[PDB]
Amino acid sequence: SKRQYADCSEIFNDGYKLSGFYKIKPLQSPAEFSVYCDMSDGGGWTVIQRRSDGSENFNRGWKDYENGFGNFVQKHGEYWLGNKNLHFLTTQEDYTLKIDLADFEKNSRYAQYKNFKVGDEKNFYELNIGEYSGTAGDSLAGSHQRMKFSTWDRDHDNYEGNCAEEDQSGWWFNRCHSANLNGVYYSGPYTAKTDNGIVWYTWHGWWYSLKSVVMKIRPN
Ligand SMILES: [Ca+2]
C-alpha cells in the first residue's frame, strides 16, 4: 500500500509546495523515477530537461537518450528525463510545454507550446507541439511539422548526413540549423565548425549558447 503520483501537478495539488526532486510514476510507466518538480510558476511543473553549467555530457547515443541521464540530486544539476518517460508522461494527459531560457547577460525569456506529446519508441519518439506563446520567439517552427528524435547511432532526420553526429547531441532534428537545447554548453558567443551550441535562434543567434534552459510541462 503505497501512493503514487502521475506527475508534479498532482504532487503540488495534493499540498506539496516545495520545489525539488520527487518520485513520480506516469500511469503506463513500468517503474517510478525521480524528477525535478518546479513549484514556482503557479506550481506543478514537471521538469523534463535542464541545462545549467555544462557539467553533464549530452553527446549520447539512442538508448542513453531513451533511458534518461544526468544528475538527479543537485538543485541546479543538468539532466534529460528520457524519451520513454517522456512518452509515458505525455500519453496520460494533455500537457503544455514551457521552455525557460536565460542569458549570460542576466536576461530571461520563455516559449510555451500547447498539446505537447512525444510518441512511442516504434515511431521514434516523434515530437508533437501545438500553438506557440511567449517572449523568446518560436524556434521550433522550421501546427508544426512532426519530427522524430535522432542520435548519432540512429539517424531519423531529413538531412543527408547525420544531424546528431554533427551537433554532438540528440534532439528532434529536421535540418541541423534549427533550435537545439541539448547542444554543447558554450559561454555565449562561440566558434566551431558547426552551430552545435545550445541555441534558440529567434532570441539569440545560431552562434550564441544559452546560460540555462529548463524544459518543463504541466497539464492543460
Ligand atoms: Ca540522414
Curated annotation (Swiss-Prot):
GO biological process: adaptive immune response; blood coagulation; hepatocyte proliferation; negative regulation of T cell activation; regulation of immune response
Reported induction: Expression is induced by interleukin-6 (IL6). Up-regulated in a number of cancers, such as lung cancer, prostate cancer, melanoma and colorectal cancer.
GO cellular component assignments: collagen-containing extracellular matrix; extracellular region; extracellular space; fibrinogen complex
Disulphide-bridged cysteine pairs: C8-C37, C163-C176
Highest taxon above the source species: Eukaryota
Domain Fibrinogen C-terminal: 1-220
Subcellular location: Secreted
Alphabetical UniProt keywords: Adaptive immunity, Coiled coil, Disulfide bond, Immunity, Secreted, Signal
Tissue spec: Under normal conditions, liver-specific.
The keyword Disulfide bond belongs to this UniProt entry's keyword annotation: yes
Quaternary data: Homodimer. Interacts (via the Fibrinogen C-terminal domain) with LAG3 (via Ig-like domains 1 and 2).
Purpose of the protein: Immune suppressive molecule that inhibits antigen-specific T-cell activation by acting as a major ligand of LAG3. Responsible for LAG3 T-cell inhibitory function. Binds LAG3 independently from MHC class II (MHC-II). Secreted by, and promotes growth of, hepatocytes.
The protein's name in its UniProt record: Fibrinogen-like protein 1
Organism: Homo sapiens
Shown stretch of the complete protein: 76 to 305 of 312
